[PDB]
């Protein structure tokens, strides 16, 4: 196996794939004028393809991923990197820099089980970015209900939808993708969600998604990501959204956020409770702690419904307001013992639900 490639063509692929010792190695394969680089943890897999325009020789090996990446990144801009398998070592040469890396046999590198695509669609990179960033923060962390640790991806009509929840708060975002889709839902594990996000880059390359019974695959440019799915029964966001949250409050997003952030300073460090007093065109936020310290914030808002008070975990509210990258927020209320729905006043595409505190 031999190839000579420009540093600039290796770097991004190496970074993407680099994200039982052999799991710490990358599989390198030179075949039909292409270098393929594969990384795996048995749960998911990233494969990058790089065209070889310079003379090359076929073959495959595996090499320590972090070391190979660090060597390549460490070389100067515009470096050419010549690679050849010699004996049980992989030689890396650029300029007068030389490196000899250990290898493990390509035959030992694990594969994911073969599977069939049942559901397929294409969508803009920007749409996937939007779907993930709108909801990611609401996924559970290390919950015994394993399926909450991931993210629901649901197709319905022509929309792709993400849902994330930890039982206390929920985020949902739906985006049109302009294709007739089957009604289908799968749960992507949190590490898979992280990877799907990482592969976007923000150019114009579209994303191609294939969904099987136990796998998801995403194709973008010369990269293929495959993950196992998570089994289990994800809650139904329609049951979490308040049935008729007809008390509507509108306020400046950053004004509201900074008021909550200040009140938070004097909330209970563990329980993080704050109280909201809603009245005609006014919101009052209060907080107190076991040390008897108190915060009070008063803001002007647009509100014409009945007066009510409601308690919330301020961290959950802040998370939502930080995820809303917008000018004005709408809060949609029911009563003191029911959830609040929060949205961008200018867009219905994402919705957030926070359960109250007694």
């Amino acid at each position: 196996m031999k190839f000579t490639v420009e540093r600039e063509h290796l770097l991004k692929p190496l970074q993407q794939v680099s994200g039982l010792p052999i799991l710490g190695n990358l599989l390198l394969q030179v075949a039909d004028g292409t270098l393929s680089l594969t990384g795996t943890d048995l749960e998911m897999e990233m494969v990058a393809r790089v065209a070889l325009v310079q003379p090359h020789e076929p073959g495959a090996t595996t090499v320590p991923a972090r070391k190979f990446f660090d060597i390549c990144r460490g070389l100067p801009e515009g470096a050419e990197i010549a690679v050849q398998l010699e004996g049980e070592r992989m030689l890396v040469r650029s300029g007068r820099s030389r490196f000899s890396l250990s290898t493990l046999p390509a035959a030992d590198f694990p594969n994911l089980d073969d599977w069939q695509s049942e559901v397929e669609f294409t969508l803009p990179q920007a749409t996937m970015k939007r779907l993930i960033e709108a909801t990611q923060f609401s996924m559970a962390h290390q919950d015994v209900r394993y399926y909450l640790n991931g993210m629901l991806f649901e197709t319905e009509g022509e929309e792709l939808r993400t849902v994330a929840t930890d039982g206390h708060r929920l985020a949902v975002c739906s985006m049109p993708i302009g294709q007739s889709l089957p009604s289908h839902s799968v749960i992507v594990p949190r590490k898979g969600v992280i990877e799907l996000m990482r592969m976007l880059d923000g150019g114009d390359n579209p994303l191609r998604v294939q969904i099987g019974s136990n796998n998801i695959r995403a194709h973008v440019g010369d990269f293929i990501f495959t993950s196992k799915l998570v089994d289990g029964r994800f809650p139904d966001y329609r049951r979490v959204l308040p049935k008729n949250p007809d008390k509507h409050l509108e306020a400046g997003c950053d004004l509201l956020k900074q008021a909550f952030a200040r009140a938070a300073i004097l909330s209970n460090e563990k329980f993080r409770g704050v109280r909201l007093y809603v009245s005609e065109n006014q919101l009052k936020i209060t907080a107190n702690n076991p040390e008897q310290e108190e915060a009070e914030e008063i803001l002007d808002v647009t509100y014409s419904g009945a007066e009510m008070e409601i308690g919330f975990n301020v961290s959950y509210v802040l998370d939502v307001l930080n995820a809303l990258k917008c000018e004005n927020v709408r809060m949609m209320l029911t009563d003191s013992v029911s959830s609040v729905q929060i949205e961008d006043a200018a867009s219905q595409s994402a919705a957030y639900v926070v359960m109250p505190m007694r």
Binding site: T165, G167, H168, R169, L170, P235, D236, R239, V240, F271, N313, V337, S339, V353, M355, P356, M357, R358
Partner: peptide, 5 residues
């Protein structure tokens, strides 16, 4: 803290 579901 109340639960959603």
């Amino acid at each position: 803290q109340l639960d959603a579901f």
